[PDB]
A paper describes a structure:
To achieve colonization of the stomach, this Gram-negative bacterium adheres to Lewisb (Leb) antigens in the gastric mucosa using its outer membrane protein BabA. The blood group antigen–binding adhesin (BabA) is one of the best-characterized adhesion proteins of the bacterium. It contains two domains: an N-terminal extracellular host-binding domain (7–9) and a C-terminal outer membrane–spanning domain predicted to form a β-barrel structure similar to that of known porins.
We first determined the crystal structure of the N-terminal extracellular domain of BabA, from strain J99 (19), to 2.0-Å resolution. We term this β-strand unit the crown. The N-terminal helix (α-N) forms a two-helix antiparallel coiled-coil bundle with a C-terminal helix (α-C1) of similar approximate length. The core of the head region is composed of a four-helix antiparallel coiled-coil bundle, similar to a tetratricopeptide repeat motif (α-1 to α-4), at a near perpendicular angle to the handle region creating the markedly kinked tertiary structure. The connecting features between these four helices are (i) a loop containing a short α-helix (followed by a disordered region of seven amino acids) between α-3 and α-4; (ii) a 20–amino acid loop between α-2 and α-3; and (iii) a ~200–amino acid segment (including a disordered region of 8 amino acids) between the α-1 and α-2 helices. BabA belongs to the Helicobacter outer membrane porins (Hop) family, from which the crystal structure of the functionally related sialic acid–binding adhesin (SabA), from H. pylori strain 26695, has been determined. Whereas both proteins share highly similar three-dimensional folds, the four-strand antiparallel β-sheet crown of BabA is altogether absent in SabA.
Residue numbers in the entry: 27 to 282, 291 to 402, 410 to 527
């Protein structure tokens, strides 16, 4: 029906006009602009300062927890071994402590006679990288991640591994840097995400014939102590990225609710899962990058002239570019947070990926009130043990409860946009008036509805707003009825 598409289009334009009219009025009133600025500063505080209630916080935590939890699921089946520099070995057993091994709190790398590499055992050089990122993330998680505003917190992280078997060179002087492998230390300054961290490495050899040594073989124990490791969102996301990308780059052989595939290469059988976790990390990294835009454009100073001069939007609005940047960056943090959520939420997935997330990644086999984050037990293997299911919930609920601020963010965006482009938006209001005036002349027997909009010149405006635009409410209500009837 022609006449019905007419009335619909007219109703929609009248609504548009009315909203644009209001936006122009708001943008010329410092008391309204100040209330919206105050709201914008308070939402920024919430996003960057809060934890439980911040979708930004929840999204970062979720990206990190997914990467740790992915390793706790698949680590026990992933093959590793060999000697230094990625060389095959004859009899090298290298054990990494506080790792989610098969019925163990260590992972044993003991694949002899095959060269490490793609579709083979992970090299010890790569396992070391993976294990250091893992231990940093688990220590940080156990203690609790700080609010996004707190970018200078520090944590100390200690871990140990052992080497046994004839010819194992993975704990030798040359590899570790100690003066003496039997009883030795080395301290250095290590760079972690651009920060200087003090690293202490210690080496000792435990003889098969030493007291308390119930293994009956002799072995080297390496301890690594990192002091002052950054625990910012940015830094922890970089560790998560190293964890996942090391797994992907090494693409190791594995052999094993059950997995869809029980032998293969990790980057093949778990490619869908890796894909999601890389995207989650990357979106969280971009979310955290918005923080500096928000922090650069503070909303604390009231606007308008403080001496007597009426506010002129054409000339008194140089704050608006900062306000638009702030509001847009908050909008973007919200959108990205939701994208991190949607990548992993089992409600949105199907097939083997849904099963991987519900039956493995989002559960914890640890005995209990649940175990604390960052805990590795002899049962961890095959389950995420990283609060993944609860963090998915907490991210959903923080986004739904951020609706108040989400509206305030949009209001600030619209108003700062209008200010930045005031001449052009004021001109669009007039062009929307012209389009309406045209549509009204092309509806039949509508002689009485021609007043639906009107305007008046005001050459005296102290604000340069020389045309006042009006909506006749009776004509509008009549038009709204006709349109409902079709």
């Amino acid at each position: 029906q022609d006449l019905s598409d007419r009335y619909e289009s007219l109703n929609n334009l009248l609504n548009r006009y009315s909203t644009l009219n209001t936006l122009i009025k708001l943008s010329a009133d410092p008391s309204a602009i100040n209330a919206v600025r105050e709201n914008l500063g308070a939402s920024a505080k919430n996003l960057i300062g809060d934890k439980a209630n911040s979708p930004a916080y929840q999204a970062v935590l979720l990206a990190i927890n997914a990467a740790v939890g992915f390793w706790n699921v698949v680590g026990y089946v992933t093959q590793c071994g060999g000697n230094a520099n990625g060389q095959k070995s004859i009899s090298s057993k290298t054990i990494f402590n506080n790792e989610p091994g098969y019925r163990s709190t260590s992972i044993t790398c003991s694949l002899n006679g095959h060269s490490p590499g793609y579709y083979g055992p992970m090299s010890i050089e790569n396992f070391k990288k993976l294990n250091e990122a893992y231990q940093i993330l688990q220590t940080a998680l156990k203690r609790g991640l700080p609010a996004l505003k707190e970018n200078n917190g520090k944590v100390n992280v200690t871990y140990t591994y052992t080497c046994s078997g004839d010819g194992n060179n993975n704990c030798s002087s040359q590899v570790t840097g100690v003066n003496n492998q039997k009883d030795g230390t080395k301290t250095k300054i290590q760079t972690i995400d651009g920060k200087s961290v003090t690293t202490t490495i210690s080496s000792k050899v435990v003889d098969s014939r030493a007291d308390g040594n119930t293994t009956g073989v002799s072995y080297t124990e390496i301890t690594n102590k990192l002091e002052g490791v950054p625990d910012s969102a940015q830094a922890l996301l970089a560790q998560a990225s190293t964890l996942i990308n090391t797994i992907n780059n090494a693409c190791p052989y594995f052999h094993a609710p059950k997995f869809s595939t029980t032998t293969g290469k990790i980057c093949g059988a778990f490619s869908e899962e890796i894909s999601a976790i890389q995207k989650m990390i990357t979106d969280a990294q971009e979310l955290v990058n918005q923080t500096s835009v928000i922090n650069e454009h503070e909303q604390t100073t009231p606007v308008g002239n403080n001496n007597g001069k009426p506010f002129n939007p054409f000339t008194d609005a140089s704050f608006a570019q900062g306000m638009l940047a702030n509001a847009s960056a908050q909008a973007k943090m919200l959108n990205l947070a939701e994208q991190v959520g949607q990548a992993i939420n089992p409600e949105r997935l199907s097939g083997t990926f849904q099963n991987f997330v519900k039956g493995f990644l989002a559960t914890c086999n640890n005995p209990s009130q649940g175990s604390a984050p960052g805990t590795v037990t002899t049962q961890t293997f095959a389950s995420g043990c990283a609060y993944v299911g609860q963090t998915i919930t907490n991210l959903k609920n923080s986004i739904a409860h951020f609706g108040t601020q989400e509206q305030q963010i949009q209001q600030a965006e619209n108003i700062a946009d209008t200010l930045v482009n005031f001449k052009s938006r004021y001109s669009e209001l007039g062009n929307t008036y012209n389009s309406i005036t045209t549509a009204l002349s092309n509806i039949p027997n509508a002689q009485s509805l021609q007043n639906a909009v009107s305007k008046k010149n005001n050459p005296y405006s102290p604000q340069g707003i020389d045309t006042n635009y009006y909506l006749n409410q009776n004509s509008y209500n009549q038009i709204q009825t006709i349109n409902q009837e079709l």
